[PDB]
Amino acid sequence: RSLIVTTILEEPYVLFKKSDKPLYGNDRFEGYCIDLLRELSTILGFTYEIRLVEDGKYGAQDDVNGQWNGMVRELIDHKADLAVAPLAITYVREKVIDFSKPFMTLGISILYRKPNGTNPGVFSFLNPLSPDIWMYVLLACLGVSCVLFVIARFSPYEWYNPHPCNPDSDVVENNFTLLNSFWFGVGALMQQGSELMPKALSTRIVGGIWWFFTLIIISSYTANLAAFLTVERMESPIDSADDLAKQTKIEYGAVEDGATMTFFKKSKISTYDKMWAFMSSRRQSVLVKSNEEGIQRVLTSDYAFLMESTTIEFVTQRNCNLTQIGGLIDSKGYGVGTPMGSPYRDKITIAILQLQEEGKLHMMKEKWWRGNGCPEEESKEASALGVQNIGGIFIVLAAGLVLSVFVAVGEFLYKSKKNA
Amino acid sequence: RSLIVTTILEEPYVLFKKSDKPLYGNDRFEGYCIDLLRELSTILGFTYEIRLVEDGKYGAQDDVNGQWNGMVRELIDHKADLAVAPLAITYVREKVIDFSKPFMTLGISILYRKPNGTNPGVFSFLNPLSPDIWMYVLLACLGVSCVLFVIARFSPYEWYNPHPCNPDSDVVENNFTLLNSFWFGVGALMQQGSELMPKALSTRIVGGIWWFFTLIIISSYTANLAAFLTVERMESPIDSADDLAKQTKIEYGAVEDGATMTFFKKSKISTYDKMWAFMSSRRQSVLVKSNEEGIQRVLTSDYAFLMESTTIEFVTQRNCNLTQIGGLIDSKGYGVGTPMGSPYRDKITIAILQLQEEGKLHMMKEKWWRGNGCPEEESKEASALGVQNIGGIFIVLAAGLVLSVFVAVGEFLYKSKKNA
Amino acid sequence: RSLIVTTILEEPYVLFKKSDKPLYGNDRFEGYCIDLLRELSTILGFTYEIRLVEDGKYGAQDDVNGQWNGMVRELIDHKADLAVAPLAITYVREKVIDFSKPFMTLGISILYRKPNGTNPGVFSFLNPLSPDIWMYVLLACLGVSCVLFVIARFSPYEWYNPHPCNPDSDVVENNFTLLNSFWFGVGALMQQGSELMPKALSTRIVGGIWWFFTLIIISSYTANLAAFLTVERMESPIDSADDLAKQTKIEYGAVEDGATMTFFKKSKISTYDKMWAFMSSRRQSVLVKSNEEGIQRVLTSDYAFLMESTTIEFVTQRNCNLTQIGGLIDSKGYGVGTPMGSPYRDKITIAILQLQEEGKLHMMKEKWWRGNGCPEEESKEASALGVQNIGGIFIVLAAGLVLSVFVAVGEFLYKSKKNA
Amino acid sequence: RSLIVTTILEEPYVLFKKSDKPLYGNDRFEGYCIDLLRELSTILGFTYEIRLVEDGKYGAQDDVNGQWNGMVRELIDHKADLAVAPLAITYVREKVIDFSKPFMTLGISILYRKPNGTNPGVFSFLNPLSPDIWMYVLLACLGVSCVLFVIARFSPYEWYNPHPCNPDSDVVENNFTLLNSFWFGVGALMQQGSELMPKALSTRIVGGIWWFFTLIIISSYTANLAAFLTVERMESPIDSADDLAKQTKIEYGAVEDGATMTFFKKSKISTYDKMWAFMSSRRQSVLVKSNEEGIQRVLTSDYAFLMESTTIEFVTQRNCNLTQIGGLIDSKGYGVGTPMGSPYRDKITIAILQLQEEGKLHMMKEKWWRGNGCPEEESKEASALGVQNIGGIFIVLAAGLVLSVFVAVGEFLYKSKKNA
Numbered sequence A, B, C, D: 001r002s003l004i005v006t007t008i009l010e011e012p013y014v015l016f017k018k019s020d021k022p023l024y025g026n027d028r029f030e031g032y033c034i035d036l037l038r039e040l041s042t043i044l045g046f047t048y049e050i051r052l053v054e055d056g057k058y059g060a061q062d063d064v065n066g067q068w069n070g071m072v073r074e075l076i077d078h079k080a081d082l083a084v085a086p087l088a089i090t091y092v093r094e095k096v097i098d099f100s101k102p103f104m105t106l107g108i109s110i111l112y113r114k115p116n117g118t119n120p121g122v123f124s125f126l127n128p129l130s131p132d133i134w135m136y137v138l139l140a141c142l143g144v145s146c147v148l149f150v151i152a153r154f155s156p157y158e159w160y161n162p163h164p165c166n167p168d169s170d171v172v173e174n175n176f177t178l179l180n181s182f183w184f185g186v187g188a189l190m191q192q193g194s195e196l197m198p199k200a201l202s203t204r205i206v207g208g209i210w211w212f213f214t215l216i217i218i219s220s221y222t223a224n225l226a227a228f229l230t231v232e233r234m235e236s237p238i239d240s241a242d243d244l245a246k247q248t249k250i251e252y253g254a255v256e257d258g259a260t261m262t263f264f265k266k267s268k269i270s271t272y273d274k275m276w277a278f279m280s281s282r283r284q285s286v287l288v289k290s291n292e293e294g295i296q297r298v299l300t301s302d303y304a305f306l307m308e309s310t311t312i313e314f315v316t317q318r319n320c321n322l323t324q325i326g327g328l329i330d331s332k333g334y335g336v337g338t339p340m341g342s343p344y345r346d347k348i349t350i351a352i353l354q355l356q357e358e359g360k361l362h363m364m365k366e367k368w369w370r371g372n373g374c375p376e377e378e379s380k381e382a383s384a385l386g387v388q389n390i391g392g393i394f395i396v397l398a399a400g401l402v403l404s405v406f407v408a409v410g411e412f413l414y415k416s417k418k419n420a
């Protein structure tokens, strides 16, 4: 006798073999879920007649008359003898049919776009030194220039003789004022030397140690920028569901009235209360109505989509824009369906545990999920550095020339006032 | 009739409550599988009496005569009914007892000691050149500058008329004193400039060859620093079982004759066959006897112990010097064991599936597997240069300013004694 | 009796000598396996008569009724004795005919088009910054320097007494003309110095912010150039069959239903199973019909054709745009076929082993497989920067000196017209 | 009946199993060559009694009485029925015994030490620019300084007025002499600016384009040195037997009176005449008497050792100092020995071809040759740069200070002569 195996089509479980040579009979189908069934028939004894569900659904109640819709209706009415399909073991189904012990484990997880690094900021020339170091080198310019100003006063060898023309023109002038001491410090830091050079041994040590400080700072900026521009190490804003529970910029998602959205409704964990407070209020914006439509909204928006973990492992290897941003939120499993009180539950159970010990469930999953190579990134050929990369030095230049005109007005007003 | 529950002692599973009052029966036990047996008894009705297995094992064939031991022997002889315990659902146990449908999912994953952060030190800036080079650059500054002082005193073309505006006389003068010849050497070394410049050809070949020495020193400081900061950014800790296959200095582990190494015997994946052949040829060093001895090996040595994933998440959570590298290798599950053909296989399968939908099997795991706070903060983000990496250049700067005040006092006293 | 030799037409194997005189018999053929059949006839005595196989194949089961074809059919039917030809010693042929012991060793290896050298161009130095940045740095030089000319003319503190030695007067003068303000901008940009330096605070904020702009431009030129020169030095062409397994943009090949792809069907190595599954799923694009069509695919496209190693060493030697990446994958051998249980299996095995000890099987291969000179020089050593990499900076230097002579003429004429 | 398999011990072919539990009988041995024999007995029908050669030799004649010495004496006298061992198929042996068709292919190849990079030269700071570029930047200093000297003469705005003190002191002095024009060029190249700055537009273009030339040269030196010090790509002096046929520094080698040395004696190829002209003349220096002794002389000298290719694949994976420096010079094969005219030649032949089609000869060789990991090098953690790396700038400094004293003597003699 041949068994009636009911079955639905999702990729890579059960998919139409699109080969030539028509008049196909029971060889129309391929996939992981068809390779499982031929491994069962080898290890059990049966022949299988693959007979698709004539409703296109997995199975649920209608909540008005209480009648099952799909494979679990073909399993309660004995129209099928197996249900080898992505049929998730849950509580309302197993009070009606009998499942075997799982051949595949999953959970809820997150789709999001892989980080890209094409807009690093109009700044981010400023990353090779930490903002502590960009601030401590600002204070060291203020520190050394005050120490230069103070030391050059009570250093009698800095008090030199200007006007060398008259040999005894007794006038004593120090060129280390307060303004000229910052211009040594700002001058020495930016590698273009100033017109002032210290002439006493007390001020040549301050100038000499600020020069060695400056070499180590610029050589650490140029070397760590050569590290950043060689090894591009880019990261995502969110790295979990709790890091995503705070982000109001990235908006969440679910299939409308699915197994994934129902989990957040019945949840009592504090993080998944906040994630359902979001999607219930912002309904028709984040709650998509298909998992294929939800992949497009990750792709054409800033959108983190909550769906099953076995689809994300499939989709993110057919599309290298896409990645998985967590672990597993729920925990469910795919079970081979079996009608209620049937001798086939315990035989598929010991079969699935037999194919697992051999390594056959892993080799079948790596054949149907690991599809396209998705060319995992290398130390990529570097591209020319542009306005998207350095960028913001044209801002601090234009903000530095505006500050100059406000001082050039100020120097004109101040001199003309004290002239009169 | 009250059910008799077979049970092993493990942690966070069935334990003993530590208290003084010795009036104990059915109440001396706590743990995960006592909270599970409490909540399976509530929603199904039965009253239980916990009896630890006297044999102390889980279950296996003795291979002498094919007799079972441990918990699956007490179930197959119908001595005690349930087996609420970490009794993993495997193929050889399923043919002799009937498990429930899983309450926990584990796998094989890898302990490893959490990567300890590098202590740079204060003078970490000084590293891209060897300590023989930093001495020989400092001796060449005292060398070249004393060669300038000898040559520019001896050369006739460096004796020039210092006063072209102050009317013409015979008052010829060098700019190269001993304190000024050092300042050409220290000034030219730091890529800034001194106020001096050589005028004779004998002093320009000194300056012109000290300028080429200076470029090769500073272009090799910056390029060897960009070498380290790139290599430090390329390197990554192991995050897979493939990464353990490549490495040689990190040694593996397992429990000798356990469920973990039995997976690597029957394995056919070439990445796992290399992992078995590491510990097939080698033994008595990395095939340690217990889980507790395997933790101590990772904790001292460079061991990479492979146990089940539910024991790692208890160990890694408590001792926060430890981590879990990679994902899961196997995929197994814990089931409530019940004897062969029993009416409580199906009443507990539905009872376990009810506690998953309500979320109780998550909150029972978070109660026993989170334990201490154990400050998991560890802000492991880096590669911007901070005060730990380049912080000693502020200490060399600060010591150079304290030294200069001590010379500033010295110049004030040496001038006043010349004055009075 | 004279022996009748079965023989196929291939190159550098049995060919036709191209000449006009049509008096041909046993003398119209040349090639490797005619020089071998000449030298096996010398040291063993026999006289031969070469007869091309009419079927035109080598040999295989037709699978219709288990009948052989080609050369191993003419041997098994005892029609012609020897089979001096590229008749590879395989398992299915050894059960029906008796080979000699090999005269040539081949394997499976990979054609690939020889990696074509990058043409840098003249202005290749100009690449670590994008062409929008090189324009915006040049506009900021014309921008900042015109802001200096406006401010230092307007600011009262830049008007200073230019003559402190020339006795004191009211002859105040700026150093910032229009030609001098450009020279602060061009001078400070190139990390050298102008002879000028700002004296007023309104012009020091211009100079002090153009000095910070200059550092970030030059530290990003040097660090993005160290990014490219490191990445260019990391990258390597494929040199294995493992390196083809990783890559996606390079597509594979084989002869459809041939000895090469039959190896990848029966293979169990995971690196070769990934190479079969590339061309198991994909077909009608990379499973080309012949060796000659497979060479043209590598020669135009990004094809990586896998044929036998003795045909590559003939193809790679003649068309020097082609190479052999990696070593050998299989290991096979060519034997002189002889019918089942013959007295010439052993007399030729010793005769082939004599020609190896004397060295004749090497000199016969070097005669037919070296062919053209085909200038294999190709000095493929690099990574020192030469005139092809940085050579346009000498052309920008040479154009800057020709431009200056044209301005030197212009200054001589503009002064003489002012003179006269 | 049990077969008598004669056998010799070399690793990894036949090696004593050093396990515990004595009273071993016919389980003393392991290796590739024992794993082959159990694969033959599975695929043929026999049982095998491993009975070692009682002479310790493979087999040859004595050239006085003509009696075989070893396994091929036990094969001619029917004391053994197989000779499964590293017994190379050659012409003088197969006229006496019968070999099967080969289970392993080899040839003569070269041992040499892997390149190390611990003595790159006391120079080799000088590698990031090619010696064309170090010379063309020397000529550009001479070129621009002559163009600066020529242009500054007929540029009337360079002829400025010194002595600004007297406003009408009509004297016209140009500070761009011939010596001061090289000091601009050498000054601008070494990034320490000179005291001369051009004042006419004709000389500011020459100075301005020599500054942009200088930035691109120093930024290309620092960036290509950061490429070299990050990716260490080190190469061997020899890369063939013809590149080694010229090198008299590296001296050659062979086992004395072996299969490898006899090939160079009987050779007629022009390269292997020159390599035997060497070893025959320089006997007792290059011709070692054991292959284990010859590996030590590669290791404790500069010595290229010529030995069999299957040992080099074994030895260079147990010792990461060692590497293979060519292809294959000879071509031989290992054959299962068989007595003269025996029914076992044709059965081992079809067996070896059967284990090859399955992939068993490759999986057995990868198990016994791929031993220790030999930790294939990464982008290694860079080490501090030392006297072994930069080094020779202390030579050009000390050679530049000696040239200064010879000019400082010269300037003293020249001035004192024209003074008198």
Ligand SMILES: CCCCCCCC/C=C/CCCCCCCC(=O)O[C@@H](COC(=O)CCCCCCCCCCCCCCC)COP(=O)([O-])OCC[N+](C)(C)C
Residues within 6 Å of the ligand: A119, A120, A121, A122, A387, A388, A391, A394, A395, A397, A398, A399, A401, A402, A405, C136, C139, C140, C142, C143, C144, C146, C147
């Ligand atoms: C003769 C007198 C001339 C004087 C002016 C010239 C002298 C100085 C010249 C300076 C710049 C000239 C260079 C070319 C133009 C730069 C364009 C650019 O780079 O855009 C950058 C901003 O850079 C800006 O220009 C922002 C303007 C400053 C606004 C803030 C201060 C207001 C001052 C106002 C007036 C100040 C100036 C007036 C001071 C007197 C950013 O571009 P983006 O859009 O983010 O690109 C997309 C990035 N993405 C790909 C990641 C998405």
Ligand SMILES: CCCCCCCC/C=C\CCCCCCCC(=O)O[C@@H](COC(=O)CCCCCCCCCCCCCCC)COP(=O)([O-])OCC[N+](C)(C)C
Residues within 6 Å of the ligand: A120, A121, A122, A123, A124, A126, A131, A134, A135, A137, A138, A141, A142, A182, A186, A189, A217, A218, A221, A396, C208, C209, C212, C215, C216, C219
């Ligand atoms: C070459 C080394 C030697 C030079 C050292 C020079 C020291 C000072 C240098 C830099 C100091 C900057 C400290 C800020 C650190 C980060 C803060 C930040 O990112 O936010 C803001 C940037 O902040 C600015 O835009 C500040 C502009 C700096 C110009 C300073 C003028 C120096 C002139 C002379 C000074 C001499 C002394 C003056 C006293 C007389 C906004 O950026 P964002 O919105 O976050 O951009 C998004 C992209 N991102 C997320 C990737 C980041």
Ligand SMILES: CCCCCCCC/C=C\CCCCCCCC(=O)O[C@@H](COC(=O)CCCCCCCCCCCCCCC)COP(=O)([O-])OCC[N+](C)(C)C
Residues within 6 Å of the ligand: A136, A139, A140, A143, A144, A147, B387, B388, B391, B392, B394, B395, B397, B398, B399, B401, B402, B403, B405
């Ligand atoms: C003339 C008076 C001079 C003083 C004022 C000068 C005026 C202005 C000049 C410079 C000041 C302007 C810059 C800002 C502050 C500089 C310091 C700084 O940045 O601290 C930061 C780092 O640096 C440190 O590590 C601090 C440690 C202080 C110890 C000093 C002992 C040597 C003093 C020499 C004695 C004389 C020797 C005489 C000869 C023998 C603090 O950061 P952090 O978070 O604590 O980092 C901890 C590091 N860790 C993470 C690895 C643990």
Ligand SMILES: CCCCCCCC/C=C\CCCCCCCC(=O)O[C@@H](COC(=O)CCCCCCCCCCCCCCC)COP(=O)([O-])OCC[N+](C)(C)C
Residues within 6 Å of the ligand: B208, B209, B212, B215, D120, D121, D122, D123, D124, D126, D130, D131, D134, D135, D137, D138, D141, D142, D182, D186, D189, D217, D218, D221, D396
């Ligand atoms: C920072 C960039 C800008 C600076 C550019 C500076 C321009 C000129 C700079 C360098 C020119 C060098 C040309 C030689 C090139 C290779 C030859 C060689 O290696 O052999 C020899 C080296 O040769 C020397 O030792 C030459 C020393 C040059 C010192 C020049 C002093 C500059 C002073 C002022 C000059 C200004 C103009 C003067 C005109 C008035 C011997 O070495 P080796 O035995 O082979 O070492 C073994 C290791 N190895 C095998 C790995 C190699």
Ligand SMILES: CCCCCCCC/C=C\CCCCCCCC(=O)O[C@@H](COC(=O)CCCCCCCCCCCCCCC)COP(=O)([O-])OCC[N+](C)(C)C
Residues within 6 Å of the ligand: C387, C388, C391, C394, C395, C397, C398, C399, C401, C402, C403, C405, D136, D139, D140, D143, D144, D147
């Ligand atoms: C005032 C008079 C100036 C001249 C003397 C100045 C004195 C001193 C100044 C400079 C001289 C000192 C340096 C040494 C020689 C410099 C060149 C050189 O190195 O050649 C080398 C490289 O460079 C080349 O590619 C040469 C090509 C010449 C074409 C010039 C056209 C532009 C001229 C603009 C006309 C005016 C424009 C006006 C405005 C529009 C030759 O090497 P190669 O082996 O041939 O390399 C081939 C490259 N390839 C391998 C990829 C194929």
Ligand SMILES: N#Cc1ccccc1-c1cc(-c2ccccn2)cn(-c2ccccc2)c1=O
Residues within 6 Å of the ligand: A220, B118, B119, B120, B121, B124, B125, B126, B127, B128, B224, B225, B227, B228, B229, B385, B389, B390, D382, D383, D384, D385
């Ligand atoms: N990081 C960093 C750093 C920053 C400025 C100057 C030097 C360094 C540095 C350089 C090196 C190094 C070493 C070899 C070759 C090249 N570079 C090492 N270290 C460092 C970092 C941590 C601990 C000890 C040393 C360093 O801190």
Ligand SMILES: O=S1(=O)NCN(C2CC2)c2ccc(F)cc21
Residues within 6 Å of the ligand: A089, A090, A102, A104, A105, A106, A331, A332, A333, A334, B101, B102, B103, B104, B105, B352, B353, B356, B361
């Ligand atoms: O629906 S189940 O058969 N029973 C409940 N659970 C979990 C306890 C997590 C799991 C976990 C993983 C599965 F594959 C199946 C199930």
Ligand SMILES: O=S1(=O)NCN(C2CC2)c2ccc(F)cc21
Residues within 6 Å of the ligand: A101, A102, A103, A104, A105, A352, A353, A356, A361, B089, B090, B102, B104, B105, B106, B331, B332, B333, B334
């Ligand atoms: O022992 S099972 O009931 N059947 C086998 N498997 C797996 C398919 C992975 C799993 C995986 C997780 C489980 F919890 C149980 C099982």
Ligand SMILES: O=S1(=O)NCN(C2CC2)c2ccc(F)cc21
Residues within 6 Å of the ligand: C089, C090, C102, C104, C105, C106, C331, C332, C333, C334, D101, D102, D103, D104, D105, D352, D353, D356, D361
């Ligand atoms: O067809 S064979 O005589 N036997 C099988 N092999 C082997 C690689 C072992 C080889 C290898 C190279 C040959 F030339 C012949 C043969």
Ligand SMILES: O=S1(=O)NCN(C2CC2)c2ccc(F)cc21
Residues within 6 Å of the ligand: C101, C102, C103, C104, C105, C352, C353, C356, C361, D089, D090, D102, D104, D105, D106, D331, D332, D333, D334
């Ligand atoms: O000694 S053989 O059996 N006959 C001669 N040769 C070669 C022609 C190269 C080879 C080449 C590889 C072998 F494995 C055996 C032999």
Ligand SMILES: *[C@@H]1O[C@H](CO)[C@@H](O)[C@H](O)[C@H]1NC(C)=O
Residues within 6 Å of the ligand: B319, B320, B321
């Ligand atoms: C981690 O380190 C110490 C010893 O290195 C260990 O004893 C302890 O468990 C950990 N220290 C903590 C958690 O502070």
Ligand code: NA
Residues within 6 Å of the ligand: A346, B098, B340, B341
């Ligand atoms: Na059962």
Ligand code: NA
Residues within 6 Å of the ligand: A226, A227, A230, B226, B227, B230, C226, C227, C230, D226, D227, D230
């Ligand atoms: Na780099």
Ligand code: NA
Residues within 6 Å of the ligand: C346, D094, D095, D096, D097, D098
């Ligand atoms: Na023979």
